[PDB]
């Protein structure tokens with residue numbers, strides 16, 4: 001059992017007796033992990049507490065406490081194994097999109113106009129926590145309609161599909177059925193329209209007052225971003241309630257047409273709605289939110305189950321088809337990713353099973369989508385086979401940036417002679433030990449599996465007397481559990 | 495040697511292989527002995543006229559050794575095909591009990607089919623096949639042809655050209671009648687007006703019988719040369735009763751929606767021909783699986799459709815493929831499908847399989863009642879939804895994998911983290927809401943392993959946080975405390991001793 005810590009040491013130390021601390025860090029960062037990663041804190045603490053050269057046993061002390069993640073990182077077995085060559089493509093696409101200067105920054109409130117039109121940031125967070133940023137990725141801005149899928153997920157996670165969609169539909173609008181707010185059953189078309197977003201707000205945490213509702217949603221967004229920046233621009237909040245007269249009118253129509261949960265303080269909901277629109281993110285922290293959606297409801301940098309599988313599935317679905325304003329059908333055809341855009345210039349972008357992403361540049365096009373971000377999303381999917389209906393085998397000129405010993409013993413356990421035959425012809429080591437120094441022979445003996453024991457002995461010619469951590473041989477195991485014939489067979493080897 | 499290695503795999507130790515041991519071996523991967531990719535091997539097998547040793551076997555499989563190798567090393571997209579198709583038949587039997595719906599009687603040739611006919615046919619990206627029910631009865635494609643000719647059109651002409659004449663979006667159920675969108679093009683190729691315009695784009699400059707021979711040649715490449723027929727009966731009543739699409743054709747011509755120089759009455763004539771083309775569920779599944787496989791026919795390997803044609807085709811099927819039910823189907827089932835008035839539903843599970851379902855009774859929206867029940871059930875059961883996760887998919891079955899989610903749960907996550915002492919990894923697993931009492935084949939527990947290794951901060955985390963069973967008994971009836979005593983770890987023994995009763 002040559003130890004996992006040294007096994008990695010040999011990976012970094014290409015023959016050197018000791019590894020410099022800075023070689024480890026740049027190798028580390030080369031997988032795309034950041035040293036700020038919460039899952040690497042124990043290791044960085046020890047690195048700093050080595051206060052510059054690390055030998056096999058000093059180094060093994062630092063990496064020991066995060067050895068599972070570092071193992072998966074340096075066996076370059078992340079979802080994107082060659083991250084360095086991936087981040088250059090991201091940088092090329094960023095540089096290219098930076099040259100489109102069209103679009104008008106939203107001035108309907110001054111806080112949206114205070115932002116320079118030159119601001120442009122993209123940040124990547126993969127399902128495994130690899131991070132990458134280019135441009136203005138640590139500037140806070142407001143989510144705006146980028147919060148619509150997030151509050152819809154929360155609702156669905158808490159209440160379930162059937163409840164939520166008693167009050168809101170699940171279809172794209174189609175054309176100008178937008179101005180016809182309500183569909184055939186007199187509900188908003190889907191949660192990504194303002195009328196649907198407003199209704200979704202009325203469903204979240206009913207019974208408590210607004211300040212608890214807002215506290216629930218922020219703690220939730222904070223879990224979704226893995227404790228990265230989730231803020232609030234009160235300035236934006238007050239202008240939004242002052243200019244949101246059109247949404248009050250929409251609210252009165254909704255309350256009169258009985259679309260809210262019966263007994264609902266309408267102006268209370270709309271204050272909540274503007275509160276939620278004003279929540280602040282950076283592209284870094286929003287990308288972790290996106291990567292939580294990209295990763296089935298689990299936050300990559302904390303491991304936490306935040307959203308149920310159903311809430312993610314529904315959210316990603318309606319984002320794919322209702323996420324980009326009147327450009328959503330066009331986006332769905334050509335980009336094929338679930339995204340959501342907002343009037344601060346953010347595009348919350350998700351690549352199911354790979355990464356999340358937030359892009360931000362304030363200039364909006366005629367449809368309200370960020371000009372540089374829309375350019376970026378088209379380029380990304382031309383470059384890589386990320387479209388929803390790209391193939392993972394025959395994808396043409398696009399780039400695709402994408403058996404254990406437990407396997408062995410569980411076959412020995414269940415008696416599957418066919419499986420071990422494949423493994424042996426697979427050139428697997430049939431004498432591998434698990435964490436208990438257990439062997440396929442051990443397990444197959446204890447279960448009295450005669451055709452497995454013989455296969456391991458006669459065909460794979462394995463050692464007949466391995467020792468457990470309790471110093472038992474398969475023969476011991478056979479006797480112990482009543483499998484005398486198996487005991488006899490191995491006894492023939494002494 | 496790959497031939498010997500494979501020989502040894504099938505010869506389950508008996509030195510010589512009976513021929514039917516080989517066949518049932520093959521048929522159990524889901525390959526058929528009919529497979530075009532296996533012709534050389536079955537022919538050599540067929541010289542049973544003039545039992546297998548290492549050298550006879552190496553002689554037959556030699557020429558299909560790459561496909562046969564990938565087949566038997568269990569590296570098809572669905573490795574455990576036998577157990578997958580038991581689910582398919584469970585879904586089939588269940589859908590068979592839904593009896594609602596009307597057989598389409600708007601023409602007499604379509605009303606002759608018994609409402610009790612029900613077949614599903616599955617063909618995966620790798621040529622694995624499975625069929626249940628009435629899967630070799632010929633029926634007509636009908637609007638199940640809309641994606642295929644749109645695929646053919648884009649394949650020859652490109653995205654930009656085709657969509658000068660047709661849009662790429664749903665209309666919305668409230669405008670399911672407006673025919674033209676704001677660009678004065680039909681909304682998408684899956685509605686009749688858009689379907690009609692697409693037909694006009696295929697092989698311009700030649701006559702109808704040549705046009706129909708080009709589309710037939712194309713369909714044949716899609717189904718791997720399996721059954722593609724033609725029911726003139728259906729075609730003759732369809733041309734006479736299709737009066738409404740003549741109106742649609744003239745309205746289209748009036749608004750200049752065809753390419754300059756287009757005989758509309760001719761295009762309509764072509765259109766009715768293509769609706770009347772015939773398939774079996776078993777041939778339709780191969781066509782479906784070519785859309786699943788990036789334009790490559792699974793059972794012949796031929797590149798038939800451009801990747802661009804397939805991506806465009808699947809998109810529009812996902813969003814416009816099931817009549818006024820397309821948005822809801824897109825929300826709950828999330829697959830690219832297309833339904834037709836004969837009761838066919840052409841189904842694609844991108845990167846896994848193509849599939850055809852057939853039952854004549856349509857519901858109020860035109861979709862086959864048993865086929866719709868089947869597609870909801872498939873995605874209830876498996877993680878095939880387009881926005882299901884392939885890593886964290888809950889209680890759903892993943893037929894791309896073997897049933898080793900217990901391996902991964904054990905196969906490092908709980909016990910190897912416990913083994914190496916990585917408390918940080920265990921914290922993430924707990925926050926994942928993973929079951930922290932997973933046992934391996936020795937009934938061992940993370941707590942077991944961490945005690946035997948004397949990992950004090952792992953033991954406390956498992957006990958004080960997590961609150962796991964403090965005295966689980968392994969094979970040999972040891973508790974974590976027993977393990978601590980055996981191996982020293984006095985502090986660990988002390989920790990656990992407090993939990994004793």
Ligand SMILES: CC1(C)CC(=O)c2cnc3ccc4ccccc4c3c2C1
Nearest residue numbers: 161162163165822826866867870871874
């Ligand atoms: C009320 C509703 C339209 C909405 C809904 O919430 C839902 C969710 N999941 C479902 C799964 C399988 C199904 C099979 C057959 C008929 C329905 C459903 C079905 C439904 C039906």
